[PDB]
Design a binder for this molecule. Structure first.
Ligand SMILES: C[C@@H](N1CN([C@H]2c3ccccc3CSc3ccccc32)n2ccc(=O)c(O)c2C1=O)C(F)(F)F
Ligand SMILES: [Mg+2]
Ligand SMILES: [Mg+2]
Length: 179
């Protein structure tokens, strides 16, 4: 039983903890052992949820936090009714306003390097990429950051609070050196 597993359960809300547990178990991993990944998946989930809450009412369809099959089911319905091309890989959101899938990224390295890796992996020009760092920087496709500045600032505040809360527990260095 790790110090980091208890921190995650105290830091994130129960709905997010459970979806993250279900995400890892779906791919045969265990949150009690891969505790840094546990924390990262929770962090990514919370960012996705704040992001979809950042726009107007019906703006975003949330793809993240679903089982593999339902996630691809919703992608197929979105494509077969928008005409947008079907992404090679599962994204995190769909933007009904801008009519594009979004891939959210949270990294403990430089947004530049992480953004390059995901762009090269995606190859799909269509899917919009939006990277957030734990230091308060971001990088989005075509310099288009989708949400207004206040909603993005709130995300960056939360990320920095997570970072200090791990620091106060000496979990931060180990978390940084895992990615
Ligand atoms: C399963 C889906 N994944 C993989 N993987 C994901 C994940 C989920 C469960 C078990 C292992 C892992 C690898 S580690 C990690 C770390 C933080 C957040 C998410 C994740 N991703 C990393 C960064 C993302 O931005 C992202 O969207 C995903 C994601 O969605 C997929 F696309 F492959 F179908
Ligand atoms: Mg995802
Ligand atoms: Mg993502």
């Amino acid at each position: 039983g790790s110090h980091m597993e208890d921190f995650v359960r105290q830091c994130f809300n129960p709905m997010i903890v459970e979806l993250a547990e279900k995400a890892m178990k779906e791919y045969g991993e265990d949150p009690k052992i891969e505790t840094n990944k546990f924390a990262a998946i929770c962090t990514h989930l919370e960012v996705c949820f704040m992001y979809s809450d950042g726009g107007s009412k019906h703006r975003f369809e949330i793809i993240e936090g679903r089982d593999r099959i339902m996630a691809w089911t919703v992608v197929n319905s979105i494509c077969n009714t928008t005409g947008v091309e079907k992404p090679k890989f599962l994204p995190d959101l769909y933007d009904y306003k801008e009519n594009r899938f979004i891939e959210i990224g949270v990294t403990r390295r430089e947004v530049h390097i992480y953004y390059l890796e995901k762009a090269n992996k995606i190859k799909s020009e269509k899917t919009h990429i939006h990277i957030f760092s734990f230091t308060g920087e971001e990088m989005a496709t075509k310099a288009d950051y989708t949400l207004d500045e206040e909603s993005r600032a709130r995300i960056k505040t939360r990320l920095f609070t997570i970072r200090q809360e791990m620091a106060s527990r000496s979990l931060w260095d180990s978390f940084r050196q895992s990615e």
